Amino acid sequence: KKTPPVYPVTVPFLGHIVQFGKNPLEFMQRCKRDLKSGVFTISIGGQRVTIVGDPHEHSRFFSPRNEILSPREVYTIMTPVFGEGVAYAAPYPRMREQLNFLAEELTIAKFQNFVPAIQHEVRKFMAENWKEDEGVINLLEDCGAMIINTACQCLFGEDLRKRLNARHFAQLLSKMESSLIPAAVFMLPQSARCREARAELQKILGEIIVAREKESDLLGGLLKAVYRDGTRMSLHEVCGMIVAAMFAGQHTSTITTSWSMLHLMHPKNKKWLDKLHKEIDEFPAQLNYDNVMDEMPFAERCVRESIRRDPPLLMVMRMVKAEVKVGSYVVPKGDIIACSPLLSHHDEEAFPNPRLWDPERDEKVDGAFIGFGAGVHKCIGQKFALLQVKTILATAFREYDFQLLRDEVPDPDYHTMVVGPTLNQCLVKYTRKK
Numbered sequence: 001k002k003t004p005p006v007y008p009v010t011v012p013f014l015g016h017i018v019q020f021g022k023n024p025l026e027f028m029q030r031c032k033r034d035l036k037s038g039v040f041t042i043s044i045g046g047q048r049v050t051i052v053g054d055p056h057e058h059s060r061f062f063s064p065r066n067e068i069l070s071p072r073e074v075y076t077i078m079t080p081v082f083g084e085g086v087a088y089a090a091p092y093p094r095m096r097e098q099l100n101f102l103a104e105e106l107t108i109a110k111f112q113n114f115v116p117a118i119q120h121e122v123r124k125f126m127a128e129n130w131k132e133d134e135g136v137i138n139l140l141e142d143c144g145a146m147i148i149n150t151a152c153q154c155l156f157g158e159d160l161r162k163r164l165n166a167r168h169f170a171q172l173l174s175k176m177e178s179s180l181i182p183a184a185v186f187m188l189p190q191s192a193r194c195r196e197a198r199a200e201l202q203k204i205l206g207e208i209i210v211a212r213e214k215e216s217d218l219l220g221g222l223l224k225a226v227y228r229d230g231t232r233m234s235l236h237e238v239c240g241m242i243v244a245a246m247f248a249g250q251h252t253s254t255i256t257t258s259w260s261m262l263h264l265m266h267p268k269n270k271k272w273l274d275k276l277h278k279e280i281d282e283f284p285a286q287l288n289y290d291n292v293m294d295e296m297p298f299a300e301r302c303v304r305e306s307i308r309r310d311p312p313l314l315m316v317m318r319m320v321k322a323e324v325k326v327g328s329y330v331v332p333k334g335d336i337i338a339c340s341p342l343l344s345h346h347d348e349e350a351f352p353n354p355r356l357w358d359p360e361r362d363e364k365v366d367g368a369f370i371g372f373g374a375g376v377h378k379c380i381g382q383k384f385a386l387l388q389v390k391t392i393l394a395t396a397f398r399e400y401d402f403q404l405l406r407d408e409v410p411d412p413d414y415h416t417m418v419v420g421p422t423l424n425q426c427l428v429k430y431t432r433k434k
Ligand code: HEM
Pocket: 071, 099, 106, 244, 245, 246, 248, 249, 250, 252, 253, 256, 307, 312, 313, 316, 317, 370, 371, 372, 373, 374, 376, 377, 378, 379, 380, 381, 382, 384, 385, 386
């Protein structure tokens, strides 16, 4: 009457660790079936990990507030990247204000100068890196830069960028992420070797605010932010919120974009691309807000389906402070409760043919899709991400046709914190169009 099933473990100290990491999808789908149940509890190093793997129950995982299902204790890994007292590392009532602060920078108000701004920077990269009319790309790596450029372009003010280029803002993020490795969620030079890259960026920041005062973007907005108790944000506090904002968008969107273009450039799917064209073809090079947002519904379905099939975030997780019920089963305080976009988006009631890419499919259980989370942890980057990505496809499939070298689409590479299409498989051949 008290707790969901448990899965067999041959040797206890290992805790399913190699079984997951080999393939976590295969793994989890096997647990589900065999264990004749969508909810089920796996062990990692004798640490009990109960997955909410029946789509019908998603509400159970995402509705209860942080005090009942706490994210902090799982995501401690990030404290050195974000800050100490920022995001999870901060206290919840406070964190919420940070969420809203950030959310009050991606508001649809500040999106009016984004579409063109990102559209322009796409070409800059194209005309300067895709030079010939016969192409090579490592799409994963190329998207990686388009995204971190267009975002910086979107959120970094002219004075900021000139001091901190997109091309090598990355290098900092990419030094900060080096601190993060697998097997940190359930269990140093890099604490300082990433600390140095934060301390670098931070003092690069503090050095631009002095040039602002003696005299608006995400930074600008963030500094004019005042807490409940009327306090302002510390230098590092603010610095982190740029880091987290920016970290968050970059792999997930790069991957989302890379996946998306891969399916579309694939012949198997070239009725969809033609539909993409029937959608973007009477649009001129002058992309405006109303175009990407109101007149690109099918393009959005492609992007959404790309996330549906290969979600970049495989698990989200909480720490069960109070006890919670989920279907018949119950989850006992002290447990790590998880919920996996990857497994969930493979349930068969919800997504028939879950390895098929059907942009015009529709979840058959309501709430199944959770590639941007749900409940009280709905992603705040969502609209923006969709906006980047949409515009990029719009621009890049207008003015090009694309050709995957392979016979079929790449294989996800489950061997990272944030999953995308296998790097070495992402080679593509572009060819100009007029
Ligand atoms: C396009 C790819 C993206 C995906 C797939 C994605 C996915 C998700 C998911 C699954 C969550 C839930 C996390 C959780 O339950 O703890 C989430 C939350 C969040 N995402 Fe995103 N995200 C994306 C882009 C972005 C971007 C661009 C931003 C920032 C601009 C962002 C900021 C956040 C934040 C702040 C949260 C936390 C919401 C909360 O805990 O209350 N995400 N995202």
